[model samples]
Target: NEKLAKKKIVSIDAGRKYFSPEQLKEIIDKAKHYGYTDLHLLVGNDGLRFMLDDMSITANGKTYASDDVKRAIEKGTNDYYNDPNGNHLTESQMTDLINYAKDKGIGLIPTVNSPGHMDAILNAMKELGIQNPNFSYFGKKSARTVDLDNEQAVAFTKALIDKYAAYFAKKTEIFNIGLDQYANDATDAKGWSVLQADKYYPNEGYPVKGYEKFIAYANDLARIVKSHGLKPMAFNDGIYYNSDTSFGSFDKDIIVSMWTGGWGGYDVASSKLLAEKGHQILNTNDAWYYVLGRNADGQGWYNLDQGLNGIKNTPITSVPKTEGADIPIIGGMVAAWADTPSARYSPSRLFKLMRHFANANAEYFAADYESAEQALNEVPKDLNRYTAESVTAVKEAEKAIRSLDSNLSRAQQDTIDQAIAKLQETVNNLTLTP
Candidate 1:
């Protein structure tokens, strides 16, 4: 049977926790084993773990110095966690990582979040003398979300994104701008609705509606990414929340990283609706989410057992239907979030989870040599029946295959199948001598 060409990816939250190049490369090798097509590396989330060589930016008719910005961001990260392992990877280190992934034949989807979950960037803005960069709700202000209405702050963030997009343009095909949970900490996950509320924005002072600004922001970011020769992607929740596209339209080129269909009060647009609106789906089902540091059954969150069981029950093609027909997808991904930065990464448990994901959805990934492996197992226990010439042929075939690695392309896997066929032919054509 022909396997589907959908992508199989493993998303890692390198933003919150600093994963050295060695740790990340080890992940790439493991994914290569399980036939993953890409690694979703979140370099910017709650904490920014990667910095461009040139950290300078010109926004709102003002310029920020490169060295000054870099130092500010360094302080910002320390403000976030002060991780003993490291703070951020230099531009040279990032280049090495990108090259290493390329050589291993694994694609890397780089993510730099915005509008929400970029605490470090907000902190950096303040350090650089930008005022009120954080979004304020009711009487309180958000710790991570940015104030979209603040022209200077929004401009600063967009310019930052432009630099990153340009850097990754030639290196990747798609880039993710995480536009999820705008001000959940302040708005109780009703940031989108609150933006549309009457009291949220100035009745006349701020001419544009908050909701419109959000849409404009999304489209603008997408344009920035596309201009750099990379496709744009965003989370599902905030794109067209409640399936209400009345505010404004998003860029058709933006790919929806469809994860949640929303919950009770948090109702997002259905996957079908998004597909109808001209966006392809990358099935990032939250069911397969495994947060690092939570390994036990009683963890009550995205623990190892819960994630493994999710893979068993949910197919890669599964999506939030919400009334439309079956929505086609480009691929699926299993995300590993390091929500608690202080907690240790459990390699043993993580690998087990990845194995379950790959095995459950093997078709979307590259081909493995199961048939060839079984053929090797079929070799006779006793060598007395075959002559030295025949025995050497079998041994040679085994040796050739043993050298091969897992999760190879169809063309590459063909070589393995051919070897097995030749081995069988040699056995079948054997002649008995008196």
Candidate 2:
């Protein structure tokens, strides 16, 4: 318990489209059991089924059911307005999930996209004429870009942020305003037109403002988050490559989630610069257990070790006088994306990922990087040994548990309890000895 008290944050991203409220609750319970502190709820794309009251808008010229987004993706069409399978969360359902997470002592950070990954938002608010009609930043015609130079675009974005902040206000202290994968340098014919034909400057084309516009826009949106009494969090790449000195006068309190996705060295100089600039960092390096459902044998541990090394090795030139410690690498997060079918529907994959994450957390928090790396390096050799029947049995038991409904009867619950106990005993007794 004392070792776990160190300021480490083990956060898990729950892809909303793939997980229902009950499944999310179970995941949160397991995360809590494994010492996770934050649950980053990814409620966008096709799973953004929330009631925005009077603030609601239509997508593709029609209001859609929550499930319509995914269906549209699958069907390769945007007009699924009447699809009955659109599964969305009611206001009560979202509130219930928030309360449930709070009860488990997990802080929730609602991750919404901005500047980029605003396909759904732009489609919904097309009437505002703030979406750039030119070349799509993401290569999809439906995935439009927001005109940052336009006052209407800024107003609409702020309103959207305000609504999301209000929805999660009761529990969320941090808002992840995702400013990732932006394409500000596109110079295609349409892109050139967008750059020149700014509503802010009717006759003159919008100047090629470069990174200054982006940074200012980000800080402006971040201020709205601050106004809602919450700190802002964003992906690191946007600010890291753009600014010359740390954040360059941007909000220092904004948490930067640095993600490198695999076994690679982080930009040491950039990380050091951010640390010197007094920004709290979250190591969300995806190379551990992201995209794919499971790691390549010992890859999980290696990923964690590399990620932690990056965090610790980042040189902190100046320590804030108030904070006794130098730059704070707050903690690490293991993220899973729903890119693969297994990542979306397979319970066993989720279980394996969670187990690997727990192991990584155990190794990281204990400050035993060398030993952890050594053990992890040897893990691949024992992959065959992990094929024990007990291992399969544990997985089967988990599958069975997941198959059961959330509102099971007391007797049904007792059956699951016994199965879990048996599985625990099986796990405890399993050995490599003949």
Candidate 3:
């Protein structure tokens, strides 16, 4: 309670990683130690197959061998896998981590994206020859658009919901179906053919008009989720482009997560628009939530070497509010994309970034923009550096803690206690500086 009470609540939109049992345990335990209770584990479209023991994920377009995924898996000395009694998670590690956080009074939200980020779904479709006919940056096979009118796409979506509902149970309250990136108007790229679109509509509609259909799809999905008694949270972009067509008839219960980091501070403008409409908003733009850059002024060089440039420059994740906005600021989330997989490699680096995000969220949720802006100033140079140090220490100290003989284990506990103390101290200092 002392540790948690001192720090703010945390929410993270974790990148998809094929974490082995040991790796999952290590990351969860370390995150818990840092007072992170609300963690959102992303089960990427492709990531689902891996969780179901069906497929593996690629790092930089190449599949990682099992040994590589295993070696890179983060774990604590006393992580769930190392429990001598074998009480570790298997395929449902994400759920297991959620439950672990709940037992410790932490909140967990698991994100299952849709539409634009459904590369894995499209990839599977390609395997079945039901290729995605349209194309954008998502990938070759990622152009598979959902048949808003087709029973099959809806059925597939329903099945996805069922799997997540069963796996996560009551551990989560908000199901984030990422419905943001549909190029409804974009031209079909080479090797991509949206045969289903013609089959469904057959009216020769341009991809641009796809936004309206996409909104209808979002609303329909929202209806399905609400029917199952789960609250739905949608990415802000989906509503932004097609508010009239998509959200015009939407239920007020849906929450909007703004992706305003890119487009040069458009998130603030977007949040303002949503706020005027009386919707609840959670600000998670790139500036504050994105920790993958060199904090030069406000510009980020988002792993250009790795081919990702997400919402380049903006304020930190925690954006200060403009006056008279009626939107209730729910907690914010910091996201890690595929470009910088190393951030999750250890506790220190992870914590530093998480702490920065946490502080930013605190500002957004509490309407404390002044404090948030000031805190941003105090963050250490290269947030990633702090992340690296924190993870390393936690890993080493946890190792020492778990290796002690049973009778003298009390002393090992002391070591973990001290290590956590030091880690927290570093984080606290970082948070207070700005």
Candidate 4:
């Protein structure tokens, strides 16, 4: 409790895939149980796969027809391979889930990618004149960037933000405008320079500059959210690698969720820099635990420790200091890019992974590795029903943990060891008839 006295927020990414209302509610409840303060949901991606009422764009060109756009949206939303029941949440279902989360003291932060990951939107808007014709940015597939230079593209982006914000306005105070992974000089020759120019100042072929254009674009989006009375947040990768001292282009109100993939070292240097610039930071450094696939041994504890170390080492500075002002380490998140099919990964397997993440996050923040291990004894009771696949997953995870002999403290080792043993026992004791 003393460790968490500093306003540490633990968030979970439940985006990039669809979940039934029941599944979402269950996940939110469990997240609350594990001391998570925020639930990040990907309400819309490139496909415009949304849970809210339709804001379909009317198509108008030879590139794509209105019906074609509508059909693409329908196919993307309805054709989830894992979603046999066509389980996309309805607007009412989403509202109910938001209210449910609110009752449990959880803020449901919605995420939508822009500029780059606009494949679905671009595909839909192709006829509406939004796609960049010269190049395609690669993501889950070859995707087109939203031609921000176009008047229609800018309007569409604003409309999407306004719609999503309005939906969750009553329930959440924060919105994550995903500006991560923009095609910069490393990835693209022109980068997002053209995209920014087109959006901010169209009808002029201005000479290309540095990341100033991109930063301005993000700031514009942040301003839009702030106008709606919600604080904006974004991934740190864009500004961290691109900007010089001009990082202040992002509105000071924007919180950066700094993430690292967990295999390499944490980006502590950039995190400290952001804190110095007066941005509140959320440590989403470990990418492995945030998703369902790729189980790693002792990964949860390892990443948690890394995040704690980053927080402890970084000096929370209040840039442009105000009275009684302190730049706080807001907290960390367990991101699960649960984009895989339920048939292949199984909902139970994902649930088990969530339990592991929650337990690890709770323990890490509590700063009690020993007591954290003790806490796992309750997991079996919480997850009373386990599928054969779930049991196998747990067993494999336990083996991975036990195999970790070096690079861990006695307490760390014991913490994971005991937690795995208890989970294994819980799985082994299943009494369902074969």
Query: Which candidate number would show the highest TM-score if scored against the true structure?
Result: 1
Q: Estimate each model's TM-score.
A: 0.87, 0.61, 0.57, 0.63
> What lDDT would each prediction earn against the true structure?
0.85, 0.52, 0.45, 0.54
How close to the true structure is residue 113 of candidate 3, measured as C-alpha lDDT? 66
Worst 10 residues of 4 by lDDT: 314-323
lDDT of 4 by residue, 327-400 (tens): 35566665555434352334554455444544444433322233344544444543335666666656555555
RMSD for all candidates, in order, please.
Answer: 5.2, 13.6, 15.5, 12.6
Of models 2 and 3, which has the larger lDDT?
2
For lDDT, candidate 2 versus 4, the one ahead is: 4
Worst 10 residues of 1 by lDDT: 199-208
The parts of candidate 3 lying over 4 Å away from their true place are: 1-16, 45-91, 128-151, 184-205, 242-247, 261-269, 291-326, 340-347, 358-434
Candidate 2 TM-score versus the reference: 0.61
Give the alpha carbon lDDT tens digit for every residue of 157-274 in model 2.
5666666776766467888887755533343223322432343355554445534566787888788788888889887766645224433455787887766321132122255566
Weakest ten-residue segment in model 2 by summed lDDT: 314-323
Q: How close is candidate 4 to the true structure, as a TM-score?
A: 0.63
Query: Would you give me the overall lDDT of model 3?
Result: 0.45
